[PDB]
Paper text:
The RABV envelope surface displays the virion glycoprotein RABV glycoprotein (RABV-G), a trimeric class III viral fusion protein, which mediates receptor binding and membrane fusion during host-cell entry. In contrast to class I viral fusion proteins, which are also trimeric and are better studied, RABV-G can transition reversibly between a pre-fusion form (predominant at neutral pH) and post-fusion form (predominant at acidic pH) (Gaudin et al., 1991, 1992). As observed for other class III fusogens (Roche et al., 2006), each protomer of the trimer is composed of three domains: a membrane-distal pleckstrin homology domain (PHD), a membrane-proximal fusion domain (FD), and a laterally positioned central domain (CD).
We report a 2.8-Å structure of a RABV-G trimer in the pre-fusion conformation, in complex with two neutralizing and protective monoclonal antibodies, 17C7 and 1112-1, that recognize distinct epitopes. To characterize trimeric RABV-G, we recombinantly expressed a construct of the full-length G trimer (Lys1-Leu505) encoding a site-directed mutation (H270P), which we designed with the intention of stabilizing the pre-fusion conformation. Fab 17C7 binds CD with an interaction interface nearly parallel to the membrane, whereas Fab 1112-1 engages the PHD with an interface nearly perpendicular to the membrane. The epitope includes but also extends well beyond the classically described site II (residues 34−42 and 198−200) (Kuzmina et al., 2013) and overlaps with that of mAb RVC20 (as visualized in a previous crystal structure of RVC20 in complex with the isolated RABV-G PHD) (Hellert et al., 2020). The mAb 17C7 epitope encompasses both the CD and, to a lesser extent, the PHD. It includes Asn336 and Arg346 in RABV-G, mutation of which have been shown to confer relative resistance to 17C7 neutralization in the CVS strain of the virus (Sloan et al., 2007; Wang et al., 2011): our structure reveals that these residues form hydrogen bonds with 17C7 paratope residues. In our structure, RABV-G monomers assemble as a compact tripod with the CDs located adjacent to the trimerization axis.
Residue numbers in the entry:
A (entry chain C): 1 to 77, 81 to 104
B (entry chain A), F (entry chain A), G (entry chain A): 1 to 63, 86 to 103, 137 to 399
C (entry chain E), H (entry chain E): 1 to 109
D (entry chain B): 2 to 118
E (entry chain D): 1 to 119
Write the structure that this text describes.
């Protein structure tokens, strides 16, 4: 069911925010991957929809790209939290495990 | 290249019409394949039986003289022991041949009635003097195609690509959606500043060919339109419909359209979502079965729809199928005179 | 011709256990899917049609689920006669197409 | 553009429980509710979605009959009912709607979050 | 008074694309066929393209056909010429002209926007 | 490639019909040239006027009340100072529109009469209550084509190849022959165990194209069938026949078929063996002569058959010929209403 | 290659007809470009409205009994407080459907009257018992093409080449000219000993294709003739004309022809000199204007000619234009029954 | 496309004098000719249409003549504002075609 996979730990570089997060798509997903940022004491925030586009309120430095099954997202804002990847290609929706950063 | 046949995947209720409400199908399909990013989404589309218009199912009462809508209400109660009408969702104006030029704009606030074209006779809604058009949606799913940010079209549950080019914004019970120029209404707000949809409904010019969509394709498109126009003009001049002439009004491409039939010498139409038929074995598995919607479609008096009838031997006679087999049946050529639906 | 993908190809379980077989279609086939049970040297048997309906004379432990692209066949309690090859067939389009087949086997220590 | 949730809930295993998400600012009738849950460390999973206009709902195949989704449409709130053992189902349940379109599957605004046991 | 103001003309490299816009006022723009007429420097007037009062029928000059695309917006009361594959001799002063209600003639013209096609 | 025209080589008697007995011709010819050994033989074929069916030439008598067939017999004698019917040779069951669903099975043993569809009126045979279908054969000669031992077909006296593929065994007055699916019956026993011929006569599906006989050929075959069906549907909806519409029912290939004409506003048909016409000079030698059967065919009131009429100036107007010459005559477009042949 | 449309450059007066005076157009153009020496000349051609025939504008008076043409003359004077006829210039013989077989040869010397086909009713000329056909000419100019000495044809003021091949000598009021087989009469004596023109007028066979003028061209010529014949046969069988069926009688090539329309349920014809239309913008400049003869043609009740009508929204609906745009209007399919023009 | 020939290309005269401008068509254009007056940096102005009619607000000194192939524009008295480029346009056939234009200039000693 389009399993999304990640590596749950990533080292924090602090202000040098040039860390890339990769979410693997088992099946073809085109560009239907969304990126979320959930702080431990906060509700999740949608960051990138359609895997390459900015939603409203997202910081300008944030960006994303990918197609097919690569879906690599580079963090560019604290904001050290776990990041989740879903697929909005086909139901049922499946989220990634999440990479704490 | 049209398919050998098109069969209604989903068929709505049958509502009687006269020969003047018949129309030639839109046999044009738009590809709009300039975008390749696909994202899933859920939406409400208009339920089958409501894509064209919403019916009122009224009645005409004859006094003569001008009656008061109290005795007629009692007379209607005694009579059963009709005459539908269409609203325009943009302005809630009733449409009917009996109405002079249609456009019975005042039904609730302006007045509680509007007379027919004939002065003496009047028409009264069966339901209270208000329009209910809210529970007319069905939930669907699709794959959006949006290029960078502007949506091209979507592929619905039936695998058919429905483009949003030329779509007009239209609001139904608080849900601002888009009325696709193939007919269907889809609950999508992706359109940013597309033009609000004119009250000319589907009778307006569909265009979609002034973009010069392969003039070789438009050649056969115009040829099929001319054949359908010949059939329709014959129907209106003779005032009678045969099954072979009714078979010419079938939509030749998958998508939303109209299905027609004769039930007890009454011309009927229904909303239909046509799907492509590749072989005749798809729709006629057994001897007397027409496979519509995954089941043996129930014929009444031996007629199904779109000129398909049950033969004298019990075989399903599709006029397109019979012509390809070089078989001739007088049953498919018998012309039945359609009585005028609204004399008053 | 559209491809019905059946996973897993091999499904090993034990008698008295639920078996979950999944059929995935290349494109949506609406509710027109069928399940056939075939044993070695014996005619294939229609179990489930229209993805939910049970054929005549079929035990109630066989059930069908799903619509569109993803479907599911479930055996409530695997009896010793239920360890066969199970194949999903659709016709929402011509031609009729089958799945690759899923074999149900008894697991042992 | 906000959803209100109880925040927490306690109940013994094997007892049915119900959730709620009061919302305002979007008429509540045009946006699918898209209920999801956050397992403690195993990541989000999509439970299902419901159309508040007609109550039509779509469920996860893996989840399915575990819970049902209802709606009131009078008070702008949606309900989930669980019919299962509370054990192995202890997680933070979210309700969230898209804003790019009526029924896109990426969620813009989220609920506060409620914890079940 | 009938007023036609055309804008969008400027220096363009050969082979590129330019779009001209003409704004109409003082008359019912939706009931008239509007033409584009260009005058090359030191040369006579030359008809370019016509769009019908509803925009369904469009015609172009032989030297223009296949490259330009006339269009109109009755709601905006604006007439568009979309020049594509611009070549060296496409440079001219482009007028947006209004056809007579019955006639074959251009009773009202615009001031004319100069289009220069050179690298 | 159809010829420019086909003319009846042999034409049978004219029998009145209604517009519902009209049928589109079978414009399909089978080659079956897989065998090359030719042997001569003699045979009896059905005489022209009997290939389709054998007529009874009965009468309908009106009392009302139920008459006894004695006064009507006397009344019929006084009246002249009709109403044909067809038998099925397999079972001797009378066929007629007046008979309810046809199939007057009992004519000799079961009963001496069978009533019409209308209860009051009855039909009585002119001849005694028995069927004579014995002196209906003509002697011919041909060249058999039998490959090894199984006959493919034969070339008759007219040089036309008639294949025995699909032929059905049928017995006429003790002579067990074969009914070729082109219509003709031939006294041949060469068939070993071909299927006995079903009672569905020539109305049954002729097949012969499901063998995929050059689908390019079937393209124009279906096109001609559609043109004939358009003409036939127009005839049945308008209930009137013009000569130009009657010219569309002509068989486009040589072989056995039907010839149609209007004699005094009565629709007629006759058995015809069409032959290919290569030039218009073949069939119109002189000014007012139509050459049929080696002679000037006798027109009645100026009409010959198959839409051919005599012009105001005395010229033979063939609708196919006139269209090729880009000449138009209002005489070929005048529609005459055909009175219903069997009111009761 | 026919143009997309043909519009009357010059249109004559409208004269009522019945459906039996309708005719298919001559869509054939002759090139005759074997000569290349051009010389200018001036000539008189027949004025538009007189090329086909010269009208009398008579009246039919009903007594019954046989009236004397004195009370009817007084009755006609009181009635206004008609019934045209055609002369043959070769012999001055009146032509009309009421006349038995036409050919009222005696109008001045033989008798002062000639009765209708019905015995009781009579027809009387409005004008005195004489034929005035002298002031029926208009002055034109052209470029002759005469090879060595024998004229091929000429190019008239409209840039159209009119060949003199097959032209027949005909004299109108002392001016011996030539009646071109495209219909027009031209005051030319260049013909030395061409055959005097038979009294069969334009109903006679036009030939011009037996010369085998590119049989590929005649293929589409015959196809268009068959389409027009289908429309005309439908018109005569149904006895009703729609605008889409009337659009099939339009001349498809520039030159002289007939224009048809319905004015108050009356079938009209007029002499027309058609010119080629290259774009639809030529003839519809503004919203509700049809450009005929350099002006907005005046519609009456919303109908112009040749099936062109004014739409409900005020748009000029040309049936040829609408079909190319894949637009359908029930207004162009409404069949109006044409009352018989001459009951007596 | 038919060629409208306009001669002479240059026509130099003096104010208060008649100006005769001639347009010649490749083939006959009937009476469908138009005359346009255009001044530098200003919109062209329709003077004469149908070869005789005068447009609205046009001074009476402008007159049109001719039919068929040869046409003529005449200014009865050249005013100082009449020294512009005058172009003849026809539409008897598609496409609309213009003449080469004739420039009217003031002559000096």
């Amino acid at each position: 069911d389009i399993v999304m996979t990640q590596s749950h730990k990533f080292m924090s570089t602090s202000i040098g925010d040039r860390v890339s997060i990769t979410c693997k798509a088992s099946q073809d997903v085109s560009t239907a991957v969304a990126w979320y940022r959930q702080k431990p004491g906060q509700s999740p925030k949608l960051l990138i929809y359609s895997a390459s586009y900015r939603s409203t309120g997202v910081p300008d430095r944030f960006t994303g790209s990918g197609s097919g099954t690569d879906f690599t997202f580079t963090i560019s804002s604290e904001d050290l939290a776990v990041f989740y990847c879903q697929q909005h290609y086909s139901a049922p929706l499946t989220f990634g495990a999440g990479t704490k950063l | 290249k049209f398919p050998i046949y098109t069969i209604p995947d989903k068929l709505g209720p049958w509502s009687p019409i006269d020969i003047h409400h018949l129309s030639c199908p839109n046999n044009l399909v738009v590809e709009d394949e300039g975008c390749t990013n696909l994202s899933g989404f859920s939406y409400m589309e208009l339920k089958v039986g409501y894509i064209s218009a919403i019916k009122m199912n009224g009645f005409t009462c004859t006094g003569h003289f001008r009656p008061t809508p109290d005795a007629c209400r009692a007379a209607y109660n005694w009579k059963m022991a009709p005459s539908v009408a269409d609203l325009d969702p943009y302005d809630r104006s009733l449409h009917s041949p009996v109405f002079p030029g249609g456009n019975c704009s005042g039904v609730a606030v302006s007045s509680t009635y509007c007379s027919t074209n004939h002065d003496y006779t009047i028409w009264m809604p069966e339901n209270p003097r208000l329009g209910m058009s809210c529970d007319i949606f069905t939930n669907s799913r699709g794959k959006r195609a949006s290029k960078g940010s502007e949506t091209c079209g979507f592929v619905d549950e039936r695998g058919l690509y429905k483009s949003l080019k030329g779509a007009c914004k239209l609001k139904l019970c608080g849900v601002l959606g888009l009325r696709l120029m193939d007919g269907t209404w889809v609950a999508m707000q992706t359109s940013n500043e597309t033009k609000w949809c004119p009250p000319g409904q589907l009778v307006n010019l569909h265009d979609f060919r002034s973009d010069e969509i392969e003039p070789l394709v438009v050649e056969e498109l115009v040829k099929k339109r001319e054949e359908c126009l010949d059939a329709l003009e014959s129907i209106m001049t003779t005032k009678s419909v045969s099954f072979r002439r009714l078979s010419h009004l079938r939509k030749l491409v998958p998508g939303f359209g109209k299905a027609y039939t004769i039930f007890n010498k009454t011309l009927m139409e229904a909303d239909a979502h046509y799907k492509s038929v590749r072989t005749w074995n798809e729709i006629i598995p057994s001897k007397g079965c027409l496979r519509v919607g995954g089941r043996c479609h129930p014929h009444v008096n031996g007629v199904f729809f779109n000129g398909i009838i049950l033969g004298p031997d019990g075989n399903v006679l599709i006029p397109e199928m019979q012509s390809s087999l070089l078989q001739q049946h007088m049953e498919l050529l018998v012309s039945s005179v359609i009585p005028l639906m609204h004399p008053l | 011709e559209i491809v019905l993908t059946q996973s897993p190809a091999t499904l090993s379980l034990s008698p008295g256990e639920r078996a979950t077989l999944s059929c995935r279609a290349s494109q949506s086939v609406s509710s027109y899917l069928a399940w056939y049970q075939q044993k070695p040297g014996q005619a294939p048997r229609l179990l489930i049609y229209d993805a939910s309906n049970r054929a005549t004379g079929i035990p109630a432990r066989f059930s069908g689920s799903g619509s569109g692209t993803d479907f599911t066949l479930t055996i409530s309690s695997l009896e010793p006669e239920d360890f066969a090859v199970y194949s999903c067939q659709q016709r929402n389009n011509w031609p009729p197409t089958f799945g690759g087949g899923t074999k149900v086997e008894i697991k042992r220590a | 553009v906000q959803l209100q949730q109880p925040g927490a809930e306690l109940l013994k295993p094997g007892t049915s429980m119900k959730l709620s998400c009061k919302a305002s600012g979007y008429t509540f009738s045009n946006y699918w509710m898209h209920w999801v849950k956050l397992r403690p460390g195993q990541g989000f999973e999509w439970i299902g979605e419901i159309n508040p206009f007609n109550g039509g709902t779509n469920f996860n195949e893996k989840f399915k009959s575990k819970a049902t989704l209802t709606v009131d449409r009078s008070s702008s709130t949606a309900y989930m009912q669980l019919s299962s053992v509370t054990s192995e189902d202890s997680a933070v349940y979210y309700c969230t709607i898209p804003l790019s379109d009526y029924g896109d599957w990426f969620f813009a605004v989220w609920g506060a979050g409620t914890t079940v046991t | 008074e009938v007023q036609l103001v055309e804008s969008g003309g400027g220096v363009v490299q050969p082979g590129r694309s330019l779009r001209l816009s003409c704004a109409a006022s003082g008359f019912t723009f939706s009931t008239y066929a509007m033409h584009w007429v260009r005058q090359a420097p030191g040369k006579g007037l030359e008809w370019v393209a016509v769009v019908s009062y509803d925009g369904r029928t469009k015609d172009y000059a032989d030297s223009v056909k296949g490259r330009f695309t006339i269009s109109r917006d009755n709601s905006k009361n604006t007439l568009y010429l979309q020049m594509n594959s611009l070549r060296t001799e496409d440079t001219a002063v482009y007028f947006c002209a209004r056809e007579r209600f019955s006639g074959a003639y251009f009773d009202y013209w615009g001031q004319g926007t100069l289009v220069t096609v050179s690298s």
